[PDB]
Amino acid sequence: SGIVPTLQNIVATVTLGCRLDLKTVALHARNAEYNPKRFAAVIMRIREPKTTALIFASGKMVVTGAKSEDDSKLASRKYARIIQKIGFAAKFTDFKIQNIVGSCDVKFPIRLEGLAFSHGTFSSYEPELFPGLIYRMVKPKIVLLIFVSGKIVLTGAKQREEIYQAFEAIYPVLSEFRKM
Template sequence: MMDTLNNKPEISNVVIKYHLTRFPFKLAELSEYFPSIDYRPKRFSGAILKFETACLLIFNYGKINVVGAKSIECADSTIAAFCMKLNLPIEFHNRQIVNMVGTSNFKRKINLDKLSREKPRMFEYYPELFPAAYYRKEKSKCLLFHTGKMIITGCKTYKDIESLNNEVRLCLLLYGYL
């Protein structure tokens, strides 16, 4: 029971948008510095560069999206490695968090059919479309699976993820599902 009460969400993905103001390169030129870069302008307008820690989607004029990072620090270090390789100044003042995804585990099976029938305004569940119940709050969304695992998406901070996790946990405790 204590595990269920104290579950802490973990960040599984961070998407951050950067804008490097001094970016003198054309995307086609980046292959000289990064042989593994994938740039096919007929397929996608940006270049894709994969690092061990994250993936960069590089667009013209220095706009870069970092996806797949496990933390903001990880995204920053990936951008720093990219800038150092190109001898560019490292800039973090033009950083915008687009999305953070967290995961949580209540370590209990949850009857989603019953939950969605009893609390239809809180939880939407369409098993023929997707195996998770939806819990929405403003721009964020939780996907609650029958295994007790939950994915939280659409947040901008870890505090938002934690708050949403606690809200769902409290709701499930209050109505006897945990």
């Protein structure tokens, strides 16, 4: 082994606590998009940490694109400050990470059909529909996308340890189904 998964995307939610006028928000923000007809939220962005926020009239906000939990909270506080600077009585509350995505490379090809047959109740593999095997782990409850190349995607985690836990648990199985 020796491989440890790399975090790729962190999704979080934040309650600003006050109602927002989206045209005002979009108008005053330096990096905003807002087309009511397409989606009901201002799509705001900041350069550091590089992230994207979906800002709603209710004052709720979704922050995505961060590569670390630190970066997620940091960028979230920053978006909240922007809203304040524009003039609303916003508050940075209820910061919570909802989804963590990770990925790695085991460095060997995998026999997906064998794995799907062996771990049938957790696996779903339809190569004509999507080339990767969808593995639904029980403990921890994580979803893994397994590819012939040996590249692995882990998602559905609320905490970093779950990403790490799942990979540790899957590695022996990937080894059992290697090609070379």
